[PDB]
């Protein structure tokens, strides 16, 4: 565990992370896809043996001795949106219960479903409340990366309103 457990943002290419594991935003099938899942099969191509898992689930695969957490969100283009925000706190849920089994003591995340599977709306806030829903029972540093100006002021408001 670390010694005082912070959640941090930073706005930045996941792939560059400097924690001890990654959570990688997956696809189902375990292809090397596009974004942020496309950044961590260049980086940790060897993690995408047997990563293919379904909607709503975690599936870890190690890249030498370095943890991928291949986290599958719905895509709101095909799930309800009363479905979708199910499957998307389970995912969540499951990569907590991966993070606490691996006694890893920090870990990168991204905000899932934000990107092309966000049905072409705006689901910062959804997607980072299910994260902290998840990960609050947990004692890993968080760092949360993101790519736009204005999400790293959203998330970092966030972040420091709960402190
Ligand atoms: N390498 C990355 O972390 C990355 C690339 N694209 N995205 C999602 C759109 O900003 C994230
Ligand atoms: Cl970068
Ligand atoms: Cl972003």
Same mark, same amino acid.
């Given at each position: 565990?670390?010694?005082?457990?912070?959640?941090?943002?930073?706005?930045?290419? +996941?792939?560059?992370?400097?924690?001890?594991?990654?959570?990688?935003?997956?696809?189902? %099938?375990?292809?090397? &896809? $596009?974004?942020?899942?496309?950044?961590?099969?260049?980086?940790?191509?060897? @993690?995408?043996?047997?990563?293919?898992?379904?909607?709503?689930?975690?599936k870890?695969?190690?890249?030498?001795?370095?943890?991928?957490?291949?986290?599958?969100? !719905?895509?709101?283009?095909?799930?309800?949106?009363?479905? &979708? $925000? %199910?499957?998307?706190?389970?995912?969540? %849920?499951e990569?907590?219960?991966?993070?606490?089994?691996?006694?890893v003591? *920090?870990?990168? +995340? !991204?905000?899932?479903?934000?990107?092309?599977? *966000? &049905?072409?709306? $705006?689901?910062?806030?959804? *997607?980072?409340?299910?994260?902290?829903?998840?990960? $609050? @029972?947990?004692?890993?540093?968080?760092?949360?990366?993101?790519?736009?100006?204005?999400?790293?002021?959203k +998330? *970092?408001?966030? +972040?420091?309103?709960?402190?």
């Amino acid at each position: 565990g670390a010694m005082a457990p912070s959640y941090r943002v930073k706005r930045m290419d +996941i792939a560059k992370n400097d924690e001890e594991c990654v959570v990688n935003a997956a696809n189902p %099938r375990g292809l090397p &896809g $596009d974004g942020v899942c496309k950044a961590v099969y260049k980086k940790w191509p060897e @993690s995408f043996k047997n990563s293919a898992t379904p909607v709503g689930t975690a599936k870890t695969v190690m890249c030498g001795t370095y943890p991928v957490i291949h986290a599958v969100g !719905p895509n709101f283009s095909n799930y309800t949106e009363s479905e &979708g $925000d %199910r499957e998307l706190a389970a995912a969540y %849920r499951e990569v907590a219960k991966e993070v606490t089994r691996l006694g890893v003591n *920090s870990v990168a +995340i !991204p905000l899932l479903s934000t990107g092309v599977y *966000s &049905g072409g709306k $705006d689901r910062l806030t959804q *997607s980072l409340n299910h994260l902290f829903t998840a990960m $609050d @029972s947990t004692d890993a540093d968080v760092v949360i990366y993101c790519r736009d100006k204005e999400w790293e002021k959203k +998330i *970092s408001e966030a +972040i420091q309103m709960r402190t």
